[PDB]
From a paper:
Like the eukaryotic PRORPs, HARPs are members of the PIN domain superfamily, but belong to a different subgroup (PIN_5 cluster). Like Aq_880 from A. aeolicus, in vitro cleavage assays showed that PbHARP, TcHARP, TmHARP and TrHARP can all remove the 5’-end of pre-tRNA, suggesting that pre-tRNA 5’-end processing is one conserved activity of HARP.
No crystal grew for Aq_880, TmHARP or TrHARP, but we successfully solved the apo-form structures of PbHARP and TcHARP at atomic resolution. TcHARP crystal belongs to P212121 space group and there is only one TcHARP dimer in the asymmetric unit. Both PbHARP and TcHARP are of α/β fold in nature; they share six β-strands (β1-β6) and ten α-helices (α1-α10). The dimerization manner of TcHARP is similar to that of PbHARP. However, structural analysis revealed some conformational differences between the PbHARP and TcHARP dimers, especially in the HB regions. Further analysis showed that the overall folds of the two TcHARP monomers are similar to that of PbHARP monomer A (or C), the conformational differences are mainly caused by the bending of α8 of PbHARP monomer B (or D), hinged at residue E147.
Author numbering:
A (entry chain A): 1 to 197
B (entry chain B): 1 to 192
């Protein structure tokens, strides 16, 4: 049994809280389950996803588990074929993520700026935040593709709280589970396989 | 012989001028060649590309040719498989198209915003121009994929002046020609 993990159960405050009060504690709780399933169940992340979660998590404090129990593996691309509609999936993902980023970038400017600020100061704040929304929207959509393609090739279950990802997985015939229910699934996997829970 | 046409030879002033002084004139000149090659050479556009060209071209003033000699055909997507690296090509294309838009949005904001605008007005000018850059960057990248996939399925030659599209065609082993030389290519086909 193989799982491909999105950032959700570690970095999304409304789902990672089922595992811990911080990303580091959430990861620690996850790794305790992953350790108890070592050799029976494998957990994968594309490298770009892993780099995002460990921006928030204390990697040094979670050795050896953080390196042994999460497999960092980019999907294979050479000689691999995918449905053509995947391109439309990626396009909607980019538009979905960028539109949200623009709102976030706008709301961020409207909290920092005061009516007395000059024109150039206002423009540089919006341009900076808009540029960040675009670049993050693009990388994250590519990372979404990596997750999908990795789980497809591994015949693994995707673990995410992102509705767009789960619908995309569904359409491609990829197994998935809602990340909000992942701890429940992990608890049931330990009980099905033995050992202290 | 089959050709898949980008907007270039109709809407890009630096390329269509080789066919006519306006998009309508360019289309008229092109249809002149396309009519005389009817039955020998077929010309295709994805529907989204066609709608873009005829926003600038008076479709009414060019009947019957504009309807007979250009085949509007979306690529097939159902049950179609593509190489996975196409998605990476599309990602680079999106970034390329968005980057171009940012320059357009940049100059447009720079001219539109004035010292007197309140905070709401500056934000609305910036948001409006950036959203338009994003929207067009997204549509153009999807149309670029439609062009690419169409030419793939037809084994047709892409006709474009867009560096992104030609590089994408090259990587995928799709025939292409620089649209700046298309009239010259058409002239040589007609003499045949």
């Amino acid at each position: 049994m193989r799982f491909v993990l999105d950032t959700s159960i570690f970095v999304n405050p409304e789902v990672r809280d089922r595992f811990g009060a911080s990303p580091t504690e959430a990861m620690k709780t996850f790794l305790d389950y992953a350790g108890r399933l070592f050799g029976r169940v494998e957990f994968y992340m594309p490298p770009g996803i892993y780099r995002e979660v460990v921006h928030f998590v204390d990697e040094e404090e979670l050795l050896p588990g953080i390196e042994l129990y999460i497999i960092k593996k980019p999907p294979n691309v050479h000689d691999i074929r995918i449905p053509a509609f995947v391109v439309y999936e990626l396009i909607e993902d980019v538009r979905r993520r960028i539109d949200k980023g623009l709102r976030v970038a706008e709301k961020a400017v409207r909290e920092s700026v005061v009516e007395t600020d000059n024109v150039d100061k206002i423009i540089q704040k919006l341009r900076r935040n808009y540029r960040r929304a675009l670049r993050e929207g693009i990388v994250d959509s590519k990372e979404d593709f990596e997750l999908i393609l990795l789980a497809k090739e591994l015949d693994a279950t995707i673990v995410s709280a992102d509705v767009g990802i789960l619908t995309w997985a569904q359409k491609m015939g990829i197994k998935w589970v809602d990340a909000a229910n992942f701890r429940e699934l992990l608890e049931g996997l330990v009980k099905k396989l033995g050992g202290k829970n």
